[PDB]
Amino acid sequence: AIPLEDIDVSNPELFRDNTMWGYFERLRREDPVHYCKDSLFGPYWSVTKFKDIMQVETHPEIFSSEGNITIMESNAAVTLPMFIAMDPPKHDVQRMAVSPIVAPENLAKLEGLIRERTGRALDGLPINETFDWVKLVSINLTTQMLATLFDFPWEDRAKLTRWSDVATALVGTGIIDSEEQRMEELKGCVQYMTRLWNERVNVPPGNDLISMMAHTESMRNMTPEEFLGNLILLIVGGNDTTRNSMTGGVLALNENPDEYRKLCANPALIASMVPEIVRWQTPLAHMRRTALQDTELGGKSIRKGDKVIMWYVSGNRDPEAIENPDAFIIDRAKPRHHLSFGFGIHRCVGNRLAELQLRIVWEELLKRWPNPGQIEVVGAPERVLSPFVKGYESLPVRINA
Numbered sequence: 001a002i003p004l005e006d007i008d009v010s011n012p013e014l015f016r017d018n019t020m021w022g023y024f025e026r027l028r029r030e031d032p033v034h035y036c037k038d039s040l041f042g043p044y045w046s047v048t049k050f051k052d053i054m055q056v057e058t059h060p061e062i063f064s065s066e067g068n069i070t071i072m073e074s075n076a077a078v079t080l081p082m083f084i085a086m087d088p089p090k091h092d093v094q095r096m097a098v099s100p101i102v103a104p105e106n107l108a109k110l111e112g113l114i115r116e117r118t119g120r121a122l123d124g125l126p127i128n129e130t131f132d133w134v135k136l137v138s139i140n141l142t143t144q145m146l147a148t149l150f151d152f153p154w155e156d157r158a159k160l161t162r163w164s165d166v167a168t169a170l171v172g173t174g175i176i177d178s179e180e181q182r183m184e185e186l187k188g189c190v191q192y193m194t195r196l197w198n199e200r201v202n203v204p205p206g207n208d209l210i211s212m213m214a215h216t217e218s219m220r221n222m223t224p225e226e227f228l229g230n231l232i233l234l235i236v237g238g239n240d241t242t243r244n245s246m247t248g249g250v251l252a253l254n255e256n257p258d259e260y261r262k263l264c265a266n267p268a269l270i271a272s273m274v275p276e277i278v279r280w281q282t283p284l285a286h287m288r289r290t291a292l293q294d295t296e297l298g299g300k301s302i303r304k305g306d307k308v309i310m311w312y313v314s315g316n317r318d319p320e321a322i323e324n325p326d327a328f329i330i331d332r333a334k335p336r337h338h339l340s341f342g343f344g345i346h347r348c349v350g351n352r353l354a355e356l357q358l359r360i361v362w363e364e365l366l367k368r369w370p371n372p373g374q375i376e377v378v379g380a381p382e383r384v385l386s387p388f389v390k391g392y393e394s395l396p397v398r399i400n401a
């Protein structure tokens with residue numbers, strides 16, 4: 001309906017209302033590398049096709065991550081130094097320092113702890129009564145995992161969920177009312193983690209992220225802003241994406257009862273379902289780059305300093321890359337063929353830990369409630385107002401047993 005030159009896919013309302021899909025379909029068909037002059041976030045390029053996103057991801061010497069990796073320009077948290085928002089060489093050193101916490105030798109030891117925690121959380125759910133899945137399952141388990149990643153005082157766990165929400169929120173969406181309040185609450189995050197750092201620098205490293213960072217020579221002189229940037233990366237990385245994936249799967253099985261039927265008939269399909277849930281959800285809708293020089297991408301002239309947006313949410317629905325991409329299919333032959341974890345030097349380091357948490361939830365769900373329709377959505381979900389976080393504030397669920 002709207003003239004092509006004035007499509008603004010970044011409009012946060014489109015993500016809350018779940019209407020953004022159509023605009024991305026339109027851009028994929030008519031103008032896959034689309035310039036937007038007017039938005040909440042100033043001008044930017046939209047890269048909407050799987051092939052073109054792969055192209056941007058694999059040319060970091062052209063498409064820099066340096067200052068910021070989001071479309072947001074007024075959010076002072078996303079402009080803090082963080083290794084996701086760094087080019088090589090500094091990026092490579094800081095990624096290697098965090099990578100060990102989510103290394104498979106440490107994911108075997110974690111599998112048992114995730115299973116006991118998951119079991120206990122499901123055992124505490126009410127039966128034949130509506131509850132909020134996001135509060136009782138998704139926030140609950142993902143927060144527990146992030147506390148363990150940080151060796152965070154378990155009694156203070158909920159602080160992690162808050163800091164995560166504050167880092168990514170739009171002003172006046174129910175989280176924080178101004179940038180001054182965002183930085184005030186994140187000051188408390190830096191203060192808390194600084195106490196933990198002081199206890200763990202100058203003593204043998206623990207297996208916990210604060211220890212790993214305090215004992216990597218390149219990170220030892222970090223300013224509180226540098227420390228806070230990496231903290232919020234790890235905090236939003238280590239809860240919000242898995243959280244929205246955990247919620248997303250319940251919704252996807254309820255919208256597609258045929259797939260819920262296949263799953264219950266063959267619980268081995270969890271192996272191929274989990275990657276599909278992560279594609280379907282695309283918990284981070286996009287990632288931003290900044291052109292360091294004039295370049296051509298899908299036959300378009302991108303200028304020096306231009307903001308480029310890789311819309312994973314569009315790429316994961318690209319029929320050129322994925323057969324029948326708008327269907328939720330839990331038994332795809334190549335179900336890990338998606339952009340939800342991105343690609344290239346910044347490819348998600350936590351992807352195996354995210355998939356491990358999701359596998360264990362679905363295993364433990366089916367051991368207790370194995371029949372199709374038992375985990376039922378009984379109300380519309382409340383979606384997040386963001387072009388970055390594609391997630392759920394609430395999801396009403398009733399377990400029929």
Ligand code: HEM
Pocket residue numbers: 057083084085095098102233234237238239241242245278282283284287339340341342343344345346347348349350351353354
């Ligand atoms: C469903 C779950 C998850 C999704 C969808 C997700 C998605 C992503 C995406 C898109 C990126 C940027 C990739 C790029 O631009 O090419 C990323 C990076 C990252 N993710 Fe995740 N992630 C998830 C889970 C996790 C978890 C559990 C951790 C745990 C600590 C984590 C830590 C990171 C970190 C540290 C980076 C920065 C990587 C770098 O620049 O080298 N992520 N993730």
Ligand SMILES: CCCCCCCCO
Pocket residue numbers: 077078084167168232233236237238241284348
């Ligand atoms: C602004 C907080 C960090 C945003 C990037 C998180 C990426 C986790 O996959």
